[PDB]
Paper text:
Tailed bacteriophages and herpesviruses use a transient scaffold to assemble icosahedral capsids with hexameric capsomers on the faces and pentameric capsomers at all but one vertex where a 12-fold portal is thought to nucleate the assembly. We have determined the portal vertex structure of the bacteriophage HK97 procapsid, where the scaffold is a domain of the major capsid protein. Assembly of this large complex from hundreds of protein subunits requires transient association of an internal scaffolding protein or domain that acts similar to a chaperone and is absent from the mature capsid. The mcp gene 5 encodes a 103-residue N-terminal scaffolding domain (mcpN) and a 281-residue C-terminal domain (mcpC) that exhibits the HK97-fold including a triangular A-domain; a P-domain, composed of a long spine α helix; an adjacent three-stranded β sheet; the flexible E-loop; and the N-arm.
Author numbering:
A (entry chain G), B (entry chain A), C (entry chain F), D (entry chain B), E (entry chain E), G (entry chain C): 76 to 105, 131 to 157, 173 to 383
F (entry chain D): 76 to 102, 131 to 157, 173 to 383
The structure:
């Protein structure tokens, strides 16, 4: 049990103001988040060299590099934790993992690769071929054309990324008699469109969509060497008599075939 | 001797097709080279993260990274070289190592830091302040103003890099009495100008000079793990019984204060 | 080797938060710096008392105290430096020691009696007597009048302190005959003005000079208790996820006869 | 000492008409001579296989072979030399060695590949591209153009070979006002033009120049197994009743890039 | 070391109120001082008989005597200095010894025969003959006439004694042309005039000079039996709750030919 | 040291009125250190001088051994105090003797108990060697040349300290020193030749020569100290006399190798 | 010591009226002289036979013989000198050996092969080719043309022989501006002209120069068996009643290539 190992080595290491555990990856098996769409890799080096494939729609090749960058998230806890072991375990849970997942989800989608940032999916992605658009298309038809444009890369699509307002407008969309185009409220099964998972995320700017062969075209490389640390600490954030629980991990993103990721905007 | 140990272990390890010697480094003591002017460091990592210092001309700081690049040189030979250790040594110094020294010295001095290149000294260097020039100054007096300008970084100058043509046209120079400034041919040999080492090299373009606090402004980081290797060419074509000999080393260059390295040109 | 011992005790003392090594002095009580001009003393106490001589221009006396203050310099290094001991030795080097020497050279020359500052040589210094100026005098001739003025204290002068701009303009100065006063740029290097040592330093304000009997006028009192200390930190809002390496020592400065130090400004 | 051991083994081995001493070459560090410009090598076989590079003016490769050829120099002495060992030591001296260094310099420079001869640098050399000339070029400007043409091989020049009449007329060149241009007689002695070694040699024909990447483009291979030999003889038919002292060595010359050696003639 | 031996015996002997060390004279086992111009000698009695020489302007002889007087200099230090031998050594230094040199120099130059004083050079000295002066003579020309007047004693001058203002205004002497007559600030520092040592000293009154055959005509006699001592004290009422460190020595002065020493004053 | 052994042997050999010590010699550069050295056990010596036409001619000469002597007056109780007698017989007495041999060797005459000195035998500087605009430094260079006409080479320059202070701190028209700053005047070297700056040389006079080959000091050994009480020293004024002295001859084999001159200005 | 041994054997072998000590060479084979420029050799025979090379300006040859001749020099001493061994040692000194050096220098330079003389360097030498002289050339510029003319022999120049007047006139040469053209008295001392040694000697006639490859073109053959000798004598009508001290050595000079020695005369 990850949370019981974590709680045990924190209380065993705590000196009275600092404690630590070696949580080698937070990723299980190494809504959906952006990192659940991508492939996973494991590394002992701070930099990675890889061969990118460029497609003409033939194959050409080039050397690329990715450097490991650090992602960190923290929560404040009652100082009653850290002698009560099963209270500590109830903080090392789904909210601590979901907070870190929302932090990497912004770097993997949007990052401009200079300085402290990762290289983002939206930076490398191919432009949507608007010549596919036809009279009578809905915004749902524009996604169905983008799923086709992925196939020019040899690979096939595996997920869709949207802003939460655009997914709300798409799902409530109505045919001319006053009937839902997804079918009525008791039917459709949350975040699915044309049989692919949707990731509706705040990182995706409004009016923008992204669809791609994410399980094949790109890979998250995890440095291992992730940690949970706990401290008594001074800050501008209600530090009266509290602990801060901090967890952090080191990642890189390798884009093997950027023709298999399509970025577009809706016309309206 | 290094060439003796290399040539011996190359024949001792040789199969019909592959041989190897693992050199710790090609740098003796882990004219002067450009590498003899800079500071030395050792690392296990593929990349270094460091902080650069910018001086207003009170310090400002930024994160930088240097990836450990590979510097390599190779020679074609014939299978007789593996039958004759004197003949191997004659390639493992007079051909291969003489070619690698001029290879790394062009990277450390001139590397435009894209792709497989190091970022070299002449790319980070600060321009010579031409406003320092005075009425009737010589090419020697331009070097004095640049030795002054290095001190605006808090560091003193520690070496001067010239083309051998420009060093000859400086060393044999007389002041207007009819007397040498530095000395006769005994100043062109024994490469010292005003008590600072001169490095005369083909890598410095004619008419360009560089002066700096090199032992304090920058450091070479060496991965260790250099190799000399011999391989049978199954490539054949027109050339029968072909053998390739290769040596390579892995380096990064870190520039901590580029204000301490001045680059300029002589007017003619 | 100091660097090799300091690395051993930094990794052996490391808690995953701090590590410490004791230097019984860096050097200093085993170009020149301001500390080379002054006399040296060794002390086992954190405060000290002394008598100050006050020359009439007979001897008046007063009682003074000096408190031992801390002088500190730091370098930022990557978190991996504690995982690789040759990478630690590669940072415990001459650039660390020269940086502390440039730090104390600011306190010894320009410090104040307030907070953790030392009392600086420029605060106790007596003014230059401009009644000594003759017609057609230069910035060089003004230093000769100040070397005379030090003799009114019963002491002869032992050195001169200038900004690098001011030393450059003095050394490269031309006489009315169209030729150098001091010899050429061979005299800007090898820092001597009329047999006295020149200390050209970025600590000294532009247009200000100081000349004095420094080894008879004042003494640096050294506590020993110098340290190299390593930490995870993020303060002064510089750089994130970085290790700090700190070297520091404890010093007092005593001024026994302030009449033997002259300060002035060049009007030219 | 060499002259001691040679004289002892000559008188020890002597029997009525011949005697011999074996020496591992006469080249130490195993004006300059031609053999000082070239790379050195050591070999245990009377033939060598090597790969030449051609440059279009991209790279191409061809097999070549060099066969080891004999070079010998002799001096005549009176027969009393074999009965007075200090008189032998007085003939085994620097004049005997410098004669062999002058004998091989004619083969390395002008030899044809036929019979008992080396293939020399002037045979393989690329012709000077006379399209580079202008009306009003001096003989020194023609050398500057030839130094530029070496770069089209991707190597750079390392020496210049001239006749002594031609070096004298380059160096001692007087201007229209009666001053010296290319240095005075201080350039003719201590042989340097533009920071490159000049080899003024009577083997080079008058009106002919050669310049190239000699340190990189060609190599001299020495068999070891050289000999000092003494004989009763009456060949050449000059001098009767005499003793012959002979020193001889076995060499091959390998040219790896003939595009890097430029040969031409002056206008005048 | 002297400071090591002095401090160790002071703390060994201290007994809560008085410490003593027997320094058998201070370095005279043998700028300059008056004691460096004169001859030296070693005495075992406190009264001293000697013979003087008078010169008519043949030699005449007369009985004379000198009495050994005491010269003493002191420093005040904090009470902790007797509890820390390194801190005691930091006060037994060159600043202590240079203080006695200033104390003895006023006794040797100006002293009376009366009381605890030595009879000084300015008392025995012959008056400068003003008939030697000529119209518009400089202060240097007066010194030249006075150097000449010493020859009337048969001896020749061996040193010149001036006030620092008078030496400054002799050396920095600048003509109406706007340039130095006597060699300027280089002549002022490292004090030589006409191949004789200048001793610029505060003991010499402004406007007054002394010149003589000091090395031949006069001798300092040293008793041995100097001391370094330490006490708690409250004489002269200056400073309270302080330790006093005393160095004292016993000297006499013998004058053998007073005609060889000239005293005068300047015209202008 | 000498004066250690001399003082204990004087206070020991002393019996009321007489006491005496003898030694096999007492010992910037001195004039004596420029010259060749020889040891002799005779009170006169015969030698041949070489005169060079500027062919060679020869003549007979004699080097008579002369005593060089210095004496001082002291009160009788110096014999009661060994470190005080020692202070006389080196800081008063032995210093003045070294100043006195140097004036004999430089500029004595053959007459009486004098040595004939270097400046007495020396040949005149040829003023026709001077070019227009020559300095005092350039006059030394011409005199270094003029020694070579003797077949010997120059080996030292003898100056007054005034003249050496002028020449050492001499600047060319670029404003650089011709020799150096304090390392010209101290470290007594001019163009690799030793300088001897001595008070015995008249101001404005110079001497340059082949001193190590042109001349030789023949040393007799047996240098001495005597203490005397005998005359009106004691029986009116209670004094005594201390005298110390050494025996030398100087032989000049080739005077054409020694050049004497005076500066133009 | 040599003088210890020479005196101790002269006094021991002196019976009645003559005595002798045997030596080898006077330490050649244990300013520069003419014998320092030449090659050395050692022989047990009183005649030597050798081949001379002649050159067109192919190598032609002729046989030669050289006969050992005596060089002798004497000093006259008093008859006292054999009675006092320290006086004999005082006469066996450097004034004697430098006398012999000046004696052999006059034979080796100027001798004619007739009678008791050697064949000298100036008799065999090649004439200076006055066609080399250019407009506006100084006497120094003529010596540079003669340094070139030596190279036509296949040898480089190794020294220059001048009369001392001519060397003074060349080194102290003054420009129209009143400054030294060659560099002045610092070049007359330290006998170097363009890196070649100068030998100024009274053996060279005024207006004549000689320049050659002396160490490669002629050899002094020394018989060993030299002597120091003492005799009663009366001859040449100079000096009477006087002892003679004589030293002598046996030499031959072999000229292997007279084309390498150049002799000429200055125009004025």
């Amino acid at each position: 049990s990850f949370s019981e190992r974590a709680a045990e080595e924190l209380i065993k290491s705590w000196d009275g103001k600092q404690g630590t555990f070696g949580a080698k990856t937070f990723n299980k098996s190494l809504r959906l988040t952006i990192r659940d769409l991508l492939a996973q890799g494991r590394t002992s080096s701070n930099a990675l060299e890889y061969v990118r494939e460029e497609v003409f729609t033939d194959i050409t090749f080039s050397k690329q590099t990715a450097n490991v960058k650090t992602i960190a998230h923290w929560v404040q806890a009652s100082r009653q934790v850290m002698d009560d072991a099963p209270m500590l375990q109830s903080y090392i849970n789904n909210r601590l993992m979901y907070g870190l997942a929302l932090k990497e989800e912004g770097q993997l989608l949007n990052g401009d690769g200079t300085g402290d940032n990762l290289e983002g999916l939206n930076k490398v992605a191919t432009a949507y071929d608007t010549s596919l658009n036809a009279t009578g298309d809905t915004r749902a038809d524009i996604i169905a054309h983008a799923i086709y444009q992925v196939t020019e890369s040899e690979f096939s699509a595996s997920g869709i990324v949207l802003n939460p307002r655009d997914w709300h407008n798409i799902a409530l969309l109505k045919d001319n008699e006053g009937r839902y185009i997804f079918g009525g409220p008791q039917a459709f099964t949350s975040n699915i469109m044309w049989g692919l998972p949707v990731v509706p995320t705040k990182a995706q700017a409004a009016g923008t969509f992204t669809v791609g062969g994410f399980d094949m075209a790109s890979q998250v490389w995890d440095r291992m060497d992730a940690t949970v640390e706990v401290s008594r600490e001074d800050r501008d954030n209600f530090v009266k008599n509290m602990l801060t629980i901090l967890c952090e991990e080191r990642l890189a993103l390798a884009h093997y075939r950027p023709t298999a990721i399509i970025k577009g905007t809706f016309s309206s």
